[PDB]
Amino acid sequence: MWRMWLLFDPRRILVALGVFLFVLALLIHFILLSTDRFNWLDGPHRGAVAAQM
Amino acid sequence: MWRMWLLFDPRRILVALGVFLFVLALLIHFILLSTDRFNWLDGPHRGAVAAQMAPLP
Amino acid sequence: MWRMWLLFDPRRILVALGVFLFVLALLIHFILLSTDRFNWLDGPHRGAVAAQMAPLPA
Amino acid sequence: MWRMWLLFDPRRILVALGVFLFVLALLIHFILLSTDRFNWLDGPH
Amino acid sequence: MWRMWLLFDPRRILVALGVFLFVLALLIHFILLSTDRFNWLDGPH
Amino acid sequence: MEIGAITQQIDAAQLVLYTFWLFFAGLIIYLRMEDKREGYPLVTEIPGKFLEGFPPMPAPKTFILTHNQGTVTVPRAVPRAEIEYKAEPCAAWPGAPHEPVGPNKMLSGAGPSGYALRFDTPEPTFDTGVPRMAPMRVATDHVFDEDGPNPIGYDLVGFDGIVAGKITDAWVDREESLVRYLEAKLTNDKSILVPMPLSRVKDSTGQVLLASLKGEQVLEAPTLANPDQVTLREEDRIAAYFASGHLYATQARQESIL
Amino acid sequence: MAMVWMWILIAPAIGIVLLSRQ
Amino acid sequence: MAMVWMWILIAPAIGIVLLSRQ
Amino acid sequence: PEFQNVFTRVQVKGPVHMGVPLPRGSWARTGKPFHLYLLGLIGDAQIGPIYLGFSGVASIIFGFIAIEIIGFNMLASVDWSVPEFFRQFFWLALEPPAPKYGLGLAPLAEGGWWGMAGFFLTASILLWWVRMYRRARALGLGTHTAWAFASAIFLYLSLGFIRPILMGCWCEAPPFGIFPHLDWTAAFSLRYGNLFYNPFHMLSIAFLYGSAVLFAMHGGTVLATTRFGGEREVEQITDRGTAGERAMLFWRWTMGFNATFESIHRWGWWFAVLVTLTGGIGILLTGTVVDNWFLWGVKHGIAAPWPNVFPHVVDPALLA
Amino acid sequence: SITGLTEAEAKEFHGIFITSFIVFTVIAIVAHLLAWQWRPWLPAVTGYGT
Amino acid sequence: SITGLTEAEAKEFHGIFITSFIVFTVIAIVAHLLAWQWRPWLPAVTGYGT
Amino acid sequence: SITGLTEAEAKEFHGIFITSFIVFTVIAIVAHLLAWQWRPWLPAVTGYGT
Amino acid sequence: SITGLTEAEAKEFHGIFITSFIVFTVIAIVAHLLAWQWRPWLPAVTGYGT
Amino acid sequence: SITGLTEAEAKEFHGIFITSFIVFTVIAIVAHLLAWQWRPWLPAVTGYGT
Amino acid sequence: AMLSFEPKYRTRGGTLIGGDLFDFWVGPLWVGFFGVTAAFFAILGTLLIVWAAALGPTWNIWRINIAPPDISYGLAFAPLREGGLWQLITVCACGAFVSWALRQVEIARKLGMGLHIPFAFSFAILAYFTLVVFRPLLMGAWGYGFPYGILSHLDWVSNTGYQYLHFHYNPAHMIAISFFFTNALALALHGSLILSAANPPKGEVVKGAEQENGYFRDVIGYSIGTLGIHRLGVFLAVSAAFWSAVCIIISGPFWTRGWPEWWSWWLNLPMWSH
Numbered sequence A: 001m002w003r004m005w006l007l008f009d010p011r012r013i014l015v016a017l018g019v020f021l022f023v024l025a026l027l028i029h030f031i032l033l034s035t036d037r038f039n040w041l042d043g044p045h046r047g048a049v050a051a052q053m
Numbered sequence B: 001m002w003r004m005w006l007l008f009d010p011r012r013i014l015v016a017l018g019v020f021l022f023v024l025a026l027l028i029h030f031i032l033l034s035t036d037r038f039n040w041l042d043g044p045h046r047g048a049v050a051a052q053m054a055p056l057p
Numbered sequence C: 001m002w003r004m005w006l007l008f009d010p011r012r013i014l015v016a017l018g019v020f021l022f023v024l025a026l027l028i029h030f031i032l033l034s035t036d037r038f039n040w041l042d043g044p045h046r047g048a049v050a051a052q053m054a055p056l057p058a
Numbered sequence D, E: 001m002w003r004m005w006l007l008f009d010p011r012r013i014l015v016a017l018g019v020f021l022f023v024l025a026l027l028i029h030f031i032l033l034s035t036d037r038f039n040w041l042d043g044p045h
Numbered sequence F: 001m002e003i004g005a006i007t008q009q010i011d012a013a014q015l016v017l018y019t020f021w022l023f024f025a026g027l028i029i030y031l032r033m034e035d036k037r038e039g040y041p042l043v044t045e046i047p048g049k050f051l052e053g054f055p056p057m058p059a060p061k062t063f064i065l066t067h068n069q070g071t072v073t074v075p076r077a078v079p080r081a082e083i084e085y086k087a088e089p090c091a092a093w094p095g096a097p098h099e100p101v102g103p104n105k106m107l108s109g110a111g112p113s114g115y116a117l118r119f120d121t122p123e124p125t126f127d128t129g130v131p132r133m134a135p136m137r138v139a140t141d142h143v144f145d146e147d148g149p150n151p152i153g154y155d156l157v158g159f160d161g162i163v164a165g166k167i168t169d170a171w172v173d174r175e176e177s178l179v180r181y182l183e184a185k186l187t188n189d190k191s192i193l194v195p196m197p198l199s200r201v202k203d204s205t206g207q208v209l210l211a212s213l214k215g216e217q218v219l220e221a222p223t224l225a226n227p228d229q230v231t232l233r234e235e236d237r238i239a240a241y242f243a244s245g246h247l248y249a250t251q252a253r254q255e256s257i258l
Numbered sequence G, H: 001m002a003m004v005w006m007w008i009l010i011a012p013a014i015g016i017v018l019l020s021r022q
Numbered sequence I: 001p002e003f004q005n006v007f008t009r010v011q012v013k014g015p016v017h018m019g020v021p022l023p024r025g026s027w028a029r030t031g032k033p034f035h036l037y038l039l040g041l042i043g044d045a046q047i048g049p050i051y052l053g054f055s056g057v058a059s060i061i062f063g064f065i066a067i068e069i070i071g072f073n074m075l076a077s078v079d080w081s082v083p084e085f086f087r088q089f090f091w092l093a094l095e096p097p098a099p100k101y102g103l104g105l106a107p108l109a110e111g112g113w114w115g116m117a118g119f120f121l122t123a124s125i126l127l128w129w130v131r132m133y134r135r136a137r138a139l140g141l142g143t144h145t146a147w148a149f150a151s152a153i154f155l156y157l158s159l160g161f162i163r164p165i166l167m168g169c170w171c172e173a174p175p176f177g178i179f180p181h182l183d184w185t186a187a188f189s190l191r192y193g194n195l196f197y198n199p200f201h202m203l204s205i206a207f208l209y210g211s212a213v214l215f216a217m218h219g220g221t222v223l224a225t226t227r228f229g230g231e232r233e234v235e236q237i238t239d240r241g242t243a244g245e246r247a248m249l250f251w252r253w254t255m256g257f258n259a260t261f262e263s264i265h266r267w268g269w270w271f272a273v274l275v276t277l278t279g280g281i282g283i284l285l286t287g288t289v290v291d292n293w294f295l296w297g298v299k300h301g302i303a304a305p306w307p308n309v310f311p312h313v314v315d316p317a318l319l320a
Numbered sequence J, K, L, M, N: 001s002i003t004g005l006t007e008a009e010a011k012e013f014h015g016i017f018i019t020s021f022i023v024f025t026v027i028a029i030v031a032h033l034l035a036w037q038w039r040p041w042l043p044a045v046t047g048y049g050t
Numbered sequence O: 001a002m003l004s005f006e007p008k009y010r011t012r013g014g015t016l017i018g019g020d021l022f023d024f025w026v027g028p029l030w031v032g033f034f035g036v037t038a039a040f041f042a043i044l045g046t047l048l049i050v051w052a053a054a055l056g057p058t059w060n061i062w063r064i065n066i067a068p069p070d071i072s073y074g075l076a077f078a079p080l081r082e083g084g085l086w087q088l089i090t091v092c093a094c095g096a097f098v099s100w101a102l103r104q105v106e107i108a109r110k111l112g113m114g115l116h117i118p119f120a121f122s123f124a125i126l127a128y129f130t131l132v133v134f135r136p137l138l139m140g141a142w143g144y145g146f147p148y149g150i151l152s153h154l155d156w157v158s159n160t161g162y163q164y165l166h167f168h169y170n171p172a173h174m175i176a177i178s179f180f181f182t183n184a185l186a187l188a189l190h191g192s193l194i195l196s197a198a199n200p201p202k203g204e205v206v207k208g209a210e211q212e213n214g215y216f217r218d219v220i221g222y223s224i225g226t227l228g229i230h231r232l233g234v235f236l237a238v239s240a241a242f243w244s245a246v247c248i249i250i251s252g253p254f255w256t257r258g259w260p261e262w263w264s265w266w267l268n269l270p271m272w273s274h
């Protein structure tokens, strides 16, 4: 499997991997903030929710 | 079927497959997240509103 | 890892890194300002907002 | 770090840094003017 | 600091500085005039 | 409360509108005068009667050209000489058309075969006085791009299917790096230039198709004064000859088709 | 509270002159 | 909480100066 | 049929053109230009190089901050939910300040971010105008591009800066969003009584339609005469060829009058410029000297007398 | 060599790349263990239920 | 000299530039002093309090 | 050497890059320690509870 | 020398750049000291509390 | 050879490709087994019930 | 009267119908068969407009309003005083526009030019045909056409737009506007660049392709070139008219609700649907 850096340019792969992983990490961190349960800054119960039966 | 690589360039196939597999997985993860049953973070979507109305003039 | 700089241009990396770090730091500071608890200027008590559906001040 | 001016144009660094600092300083002054506590002109409400 | 004029054209600096200083002064005057306290024409309301 | 009222009936927005109308009238006058820097004053069916129309012709302006090819003043006090076109009027009254003469109407200089007496020197590049259009055998720094057709060696075919010659070289624009002419070796050993905008490169059959001329009419196309450069006037001659074929190649192309 | 404005206005001006003599 | 802003403002400046003198 | 010159499949690779030498003191051009066959089909194949002087870099920094202010607030308006950001992206905006604050600086949550984004974006646009002006001078060209650009800036400033000042409220300015700024455009017409009856809106439309008419006519004229080298327009201007003569004769025989290869670009220049010049003036008039354009139209005798097919109705609020 | 590296360079890069991948993943595994302790995900169909 | 200035004229401009900068700042300083006398800024947290 | 860097001038850059990263990270670490003392994050599922 | 400056002049720019950076930072530090005196930031979770 | 890969390397790449595909699928199978344990899909016509 | 270079170009031929009978010039204008037809339709159509105005209540040029028939008449030819005159004027306009385009084809053939100009104009004709025949045909009534009046046809546009309660949300409307706005931006740029090259500062030499391509590479990093910009000018203007025709043909025959409601397909995509 080491015979892949002769097939793919390491400079292009590392730059693409760096952008992809940062965007992915931004996406996940952002989604958790939007949740009520996993928001680590303001915490739970930030808005008004109608009671359910 | 190893001959499939004598026909198609491996560099393009792996890049095309990698892009294809990520987009599909991203699509599937997002469809489940939008559901109430398969949302693994909060569960059902309650649709919280702002705490108070913006005051009238 | 000194050998990596023969493959990646230090000019390109430093410029891309500086822009990326500032935008990230700017984003994180903004996110904190967009919270009541971590707002370090006015504090945890959000001020009341004015009426949007209002006439021109005359 | 005196060698960082061998690979970076000092004219280009100063121009980018000069605009950046002024824009950032404008940004911070603007933010404070739009706060209740740190508005130094009309003061707090 | 006099060595900066070997790096930057004095003619370019003066015109850019003149425009920058005028717009900045125009911005500050406008901001003050739109406040209640520092409006020097009609005064406080 | 009537803000913007000048009188009981005239208001500010109305006055601003009439201000624009005055400006727009002046702008149209200015634009129409600028339109009259070429081809004016008009010629009539009188030896010495000229019309300038309204608005009148503008004051002259001068263009400075590169590489010491002179100064151009428009409108010209003395207009450029016209080519000696060969046509017979279809009637004597004004407004009647004329019919080009000669067995080869593309050489008559009438109708679409007419051309302007431009500069008799090659168009130069801005950086150097080097001719702008050059064959690729001279402009060796230009090569055909891959994944695109290479017309060198193709047959030159008229719209009647008759092969007139083979494509030998391409002429490129040294300023914009594009093909403007294909050079073809004709069966009479003539080496004419064909305009790229009038050539259909069919790389499937290895042919360059001419929809404007028959195969035999290609053999009478203009030739360059010297083989490595083309003047502005020659460019006009070549374009006029090929393009006039759409009206003059056959008698059918000149008559009403329905 | 005048001292706040005095430093932020005057001290940069002195800084330019002091950086200029060197 | 003065030290919260004093560190984040001054320490990078010291770091830059020390890194420059390297 | 004949070659229609829709796109160019036969292409040649020449040495990259870096441009004319720049005047002393200018920067070096940025980037290594390369040939692209895809763009060579419809236009020129070379991408780059680019010149990044003081105006260009300053404009980018100012503009990028403004874009960050918009994007961060848009993302905060969906509570940082990326799925909701993609779902609602067209609906999101950075809203202008509330009417309470007039021309003063609003709080951040109530229009303060809008004003800062408006300032930084305006600075970026003005700095770009300097770039368009100075790049033309560096090449020995006229500044026609910069002054045409100033016309577009005039409408932009009238919408967001001049008119809100004349009205005394930043709340009258458009928001920074895709669908919301369409809502603002429609709400503007609703508030001020059918902007169709604004005469400068009529003129701006006439020139907007006229720009489409002229460019279709002019582009078609040049394409129809590319067989005569008609696209080499400046050379046709200084030394008229058969392409210029046929182009002039086509329109003279069609409608009785014609332009020249130079003057047609003056017609096109003014028609595009007058779109935003008349548009800017019309926007400055509404609410300042005219409050209801249809009633203004009725006053000035341009309201067509449509029949009323319904029985007469009385405003029920009067009798209450 | 389509990329342009040598026989030795490709293997040396492979060792560095895998090691960096291991370190990055190991840190993320620790981070997910800490995150799970703070706030577990994957609720029951009826909710988390304290 | 990338700008294209000799030592003599570069020093001359620098001297004039500093003097103009000092004169401009001094006038501005007195302007701020008069402005502060007309209407002070930087209120206390409770407001200006007349 | 696609970059165009000698082995001597490339190892020196790696040395300068690493120490700048460490200095930058150490300052940020202390900043986060101060930030935690001012206002801790990561609340309980109930809330911060003052 | 991709930039086009000699070793000697790079050192001189570095000395001027760092000195200007220190002067600018020190003035900013005093400004923040005065700003903190006028109006402190970073309140407690219960607010500034006058 | 349109691809240009020789016979020896093409069979080697296929062996790597098939082995990677098997490992990727096997992990996905266990992932779906765990997902089915946490929350089944494919409900009855009347719903999942409970 | 003729331009200085004109006389050599006035050849016989290029006509599609008629031949030498109508192949002559009146002043600067060439006539041909379709020039006769265009003149006939234009004059008759204009005269009918004036007669319809004479039947109306005003001679004010801005307030003249010639309206189509009632919807109840369907696709029938209405009486002249109740929309029949509008139908006749519409037929004259259709004949005049097609004859004008066909006349341009003959003129271009006489000069040995391409047919790009009549091709571009045909898209303007398509938009008009969409407004007055194609859309009314799909709705089944000629009453859907816009009235002929300088200010009255703006009232039709306004009321038609609010039959969908927010016409900005029409998706083909957005595309068409994007083409109109870009075309004006492209026209301003192209006119500026040619004038800047042909009219440099006084005493300076005229500039060519090197500065023209160099200018936009410096400011934006790419130049489309002289051939590309004229291709772009046609493409933008033609597509603005084409998508304008699309935006109105789908308003009522293929969409009867508010246009913002149409965007619920995007809001309800399963990746983020509520």
Ligand code: BCL
Residues within 6 Å of the ligand: A014, A015, A017, A018, A019, A021, A022, A025, A026, A029, A032, A038, A040, C008, C013, C020, C028, J024, J025, J027, J028, J029, J031, J032, J035, L042
């Ligand atoms: C919600 C509960 C926790 C939390 C839960 C988690 C969990 C779980 C994880 C993280 C992880 C991370 N968290 Mg956390 N995190 C929280 C809140 C935060 C906050 C904040 C302001 O509150 C910040 C700043 C962070 C920051 C971080 C990062 C340190 C880290 C993501 C690494 C990454 O993106 O690599 C992207 C960048 C790269 C991979 C560099 C690429 C290098 C390339 C290959 C080499 C060439 C470079 C090339 C030339 C240039 C391009 C690359 C550029 C970077 C663009 N978290 C809260 C408090 N966090 C992840 C982690 O620990 O990863 C180790 C992780 O698994």
Ligand code: BCL
Residues within 6 Å of the ligand: I067, I070, I125, I152, I153, I155, I156, I159, I176, I184, I185, I186, I188, I189, I194, I195, I196, I200, I201, I204, I205, I206, I208, I275, I276, I278, I279, I280, I282, I283, O157, O181, O184
């Ligand atoms: C229901 C809505 C109303 C209506 C309300 C308005 C309002 C309000 C306005 C118009 C305006 C116009 N209307 Mg209208 N209009 C109506 C119906 C029409 C109809 C029709 C057939 O129904 C047409 C064809 C038009 C056409 C027009 C144009 C002639 C004119 C816009 C000129 C322009 O190009 O601006 C587009 C160009 C600009 C806005 C300038 C842009 C230049 C700047 C520099 C851009 C910088 C970009 C920056 C660098 C990038 C930032 C990106 C960041 C992420 C933010 N309207 C109806 C009646 N209309 C405008 C006008 O001028 O009226 C007099 C205007 O303000």
Ligand code: BCL
Residues within 6 Å of the ligand: E014, E015, E016, E017, E018, E019, E021, E022, E025, E026, E029, E032, E038, E040, K024, K027, K028, K029, K031, K032, K035
């Ligand atoms: C509280 C509000 C007070 C007030 C408090 C203050 C205070 C405090 C100050 C001012 C200052 C100014 N005020 Mg005040 N001011 C008020 C009301 C006014 C009114 C009015 C109609 O009411 C006017 C006309 C002014 C006018 C002025 C200016 C004289 C001055 C700003 C100088 C400047 O912009 O330099 C910018 C332009 C340059 C520096 C150009 C210099 C030449 C260049 C560098 C050389 C080459 C030029 C090159 C060709 C480029 C040219 C570009 C163009 C100049 C644009 N004030 C009210 C009453 N005012 C400032 C001052 O006095 O500074 C001297 C100042 O500190």
Ligand SMILES: CC[C@H]1c2cc3[nH]c4c(c3C)C(=O)[C@H](C(=O)OC)c4c3nc(cc4[nH]c(cc(n2)[C@@H]1C)c(C(C)=O)c4C)[C@@H](C)[C@@H]3CCC(=O)OC/C=C(/C)CCC[C@H](C)CCC[C@H](C)CCCC(C)C
Residues within 6 Å of the ligand: C019, C022, I059, I060, I061, I062, I063, I064, I065, I067, I121, I124, I125, I128, I132, I145, I146, I148, I149, I150, I151, I152, I272, I273, I274, I275, I276, O181, O182, O184, O185, O188, O189, O219, O220
């Ligand atoms: C005559 C009127 C018409 C017109 C004309 C016109 N427009 C023009 C011009 C002209 C003549 C120009 O010369 C100018 C131009 O440059 O054209 C190519 C322009 C222009 N008209 C434009 C748009 C435009 N024009 C429009 C309309 C019109 N323009 C009218 C129809 C519209 C509409 C219809 O709404 C739009 C949207 C631009 C393409 C351009 C002006 C560009 C500009 O101002 O650029 C600066 C603005 C910014 C927001 C800066 C961008 C910053 C980058 C996005 C940053 C990227 C990241 C960054 C590098 C990271 C690092 C940053 C660090 C700080 C960290």
Ligand SMILES: COC(C)(C)C/C=C/C(C)=C/C=C/C(C)=C/C=C/C(C)=C/C=C\C=C(C)\C=C\C=C(C)\C=C\C=C(/C)C(=O)CCC(C)(C)OC
Residues within 6 Å of the ligand: C023, D030, I067, I068, I070, I071, I072, I104, I105, I114, I115, I116, I118, I119, I122, I156, I157, I159, I160, I161, I170, I173, I174, I175, I176, I177, I178, I181
């Ligand atoms: C990593 O970052 C990313 C995530 C990539 C960022 C992403 C950013 C995104 C997605 C941004 C999207 C933006 C979008 C879609 C924007 C759309 C905007 C649109 C359509 C705008 C339309 C019209 C807007 C107009 C005309 C606005 C004009 C405003 C003006 C002229 C304001 C001028 C006032 C000036 C000059 C001031 O001095 C006043 C300043 C002050 C006094 C402080 O406040 C009062």
Ligand SMILES: [Fe+3]
Residues within 6 Å of the ligand: I218, I222, I233, I265, O190, O194, O230
């Ligand atoms: Fe053109």
